[PDB]
Symmetry: C3
Subunit: 287 residues, 3 copies
């Protein structure tokens, strides 16, 4: 069987270890993507764990991803923040990539906020823009790479969970209204995020495929975390920072490259911090 290497008991031990070693009790988990680790600077009463301390955690390998779990309060809300994440392209199976999401469920988290860098496929997008994720296209999932493959553990969720309501309608409505409170020249964009495995960037022909399929942005993460979160009942909210426009003609001499991506994160850090801090107020209270 191509199954989950972790048992329920493995997820439980990691959860109990974290509950022993901190007094924090997060309601919200935030996964910070490529060059968005500055979202953990505004946390009050921060307690930090390195991923290598925490039993059963995977290592973080990619530049701009620190490898640190941080508990704290963000604008009043009890939060846990993954400073850096795991990617299929680093060689991890998807049951390792998504291991933290289930641990968070067992801590008592009820809301997952997922952030990423993404390449812009919709031509109306501009570098620096923030796109709310209305929906995704899980290209690896079509082929068999789904983190729920293998035996289903009823203790987390259903054998066959729906994803047609994955991205919380209500939190999206509130973040569109709230957008007035940043007075930005640019509007809050909304669209479909497509996951591709990477780690190489898209050809022009691939870019046009993705546009034709109806995607507005592209990246190499996030979707598996969303599936596992919806499987175990988490409210999910997501956004992408558009870090580059994907090359869509043969004439251009520009090329996607990681430095440009990291650089668009340094520029946007102020705007995101403020966006996320306001978002926290729009999250429903528990129970």
């Amino acid at each position: 069987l191509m199954e989950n290497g972790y048992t329920y008991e493995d997820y439980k031990n990691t959860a109990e270890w974290l509950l022993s070693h901190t007094k924090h009790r997060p309601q919200v988990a935030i996964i910070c993507g490529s060059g968005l680790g500055g979202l953990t600077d505004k946390l009050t009463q921060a307690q930090i764990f390195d991923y290598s301390e925490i039993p059963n955690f995977p290592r973080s390998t990619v530049p701009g991803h620190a490898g640190r779990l941080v508990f704290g309060f963000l604008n009043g809300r009890a939060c846990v923040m993954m400073q850096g994440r795991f990617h299929m392209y680093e060689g991890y199976p998807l049951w390792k990539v998504t291991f933290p999401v289930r641990v968070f469920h067992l801590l008592g988290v009820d809301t997952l906020v997922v952030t990423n860098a993404a390449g812009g496929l919709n031509p109306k997008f501009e570098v620096g823009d923030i796109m709310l994720i209305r929906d995704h296209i899980n290209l690896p999932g079509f082929s068999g790479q789904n983190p729920l493959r293998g035996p289903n553990d009823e203790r987390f969720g259903d054998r066959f969970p729906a994803m047609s309501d994955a991205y919380d309608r209500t939190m999206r409505q509130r973040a569109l209204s709230t957008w007035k409170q940043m007075g930005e020249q640019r509007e809050l964009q909304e669209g479909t995020y497509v996951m591709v495995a990477g780690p190489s960037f898209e050809t022009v022909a691939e870019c046009r495929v993705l546009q034709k399929l109806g995607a507005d942005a592209v990246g190499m993460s996030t979707v598996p975390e969303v599936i596992v979160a919806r499987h175990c009942g988490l409210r999910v909210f997501g956004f992408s920072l558009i870090t580059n426009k994907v090359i869509m003609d043969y004439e251009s001499l520009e090329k996607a490259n990681h430095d440009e991506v990291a650089a668009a994160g340094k520029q946007a850090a102020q705007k995101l911090e403020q966006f996320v801090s306001i978002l926290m107020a729009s999250i429903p209270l528990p129970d």
Copy 2:
């Protein structure tokens, strides 16, 4: 470091010889029964039942509404073997396990495979309860590497590079379409393209729109691997889907795909499916 079939020729043959030893039945036609369609075995005569767990080298069905039994008998006087329950790659099985029984059926003497499944309707003219004849398929996992024929080719089964443009028998499709009049149902017999996705999660709205843009009429998580292995070894293949739900294609809808609704639409379409298959048996050729 080689990604190959974990069964040897000898494993298939051993399983086939075990089966031939423990039954007097000698099936000509194999029928694979999908989700909610296990009632297709109800009208077999002189039935003999094996549990999958008794049969050497056989995998286990882990999905609700797949009984996990191999049933030999007579359907409208034709010698059949029926898989009451099937396997899926979402369960953890490699495609070489999922398709194990198709090659066993070849070694037993079977020459025609009937595949059935439940499917989500993507074509808006389909209603819940419709039967779709599978004209063709789109093998999305196959594009990316997940093909049951990956690895060394065994010439005892078939060619290294089998064609699939003729996978679903053109003559039985003519005969089944013209035969439909024999049941005097309100809906006509639907026809279309089946697309496989791995699952086990259901589609997002954006994914539903992808599959519609690609030209699929219905979506499921099975069948295609079985059909590829069947064509590779020379089997004639006929397929159909029961449309159990319309896949959600807009953000406003309250409706959600779920297994209980799928299984219930299965049992509602019970009588009707048994009857269609029974009459279909009369259109399958004998050897010689």
Copy 3:
């Protein structure tokens, strides 16, 4: 459980040193010959042949029409190494084995990779026997995780996240087309997008239609992984396909894709292929 390249840097280095000691040839250009295109080695002078089986760490070719030899020599006065036969993921090889020679060629001092293949024509204006210059590719297995660069990156070869938008060298492409015009050719040179599918089974009609809708002009089961590895380590890349057959795009045809027709095409195209390879070799810049 970590899904990584099974070769160390020192495996590649050992294979490269072994080749450097066993031949005096010092190639600048590597050419990978695909199905039925092994005849491109005939015009090499001062040829020195190695069977893949005698070279350390080399995989084996298992497909008919792939001789399994590495040939060093001069092709039109330019120092080349030719793979007479390549490896495919459908044989069961992981993509890090499929692409193993590309990095060996880098360490031998090669600076240009030419990739050739047979392909099925999707664009209806292509005829059997056409040569299509590859302007671009669509890596369908790559979308799903089947990428030869997956796992830890070795900085000794290249970057973690390499760009592919400029993979097929534009200048070589321009020169090849100018030259073909300057010759005053009747049948103009085709240019288009190659899509990789895993195989080994050929496409259904519905699958052919999907690949047309995605913007692909030609379909095969190779090439793309080699190009990705080539670009990762700084090689200049040029590809072309021989269109060996037209992909079946309607249900009324009785034709079927088959391997025999693919070999018949290669022998038939031999003079055309030689002429094109000459044009192409004279388009490759010299080192400084």
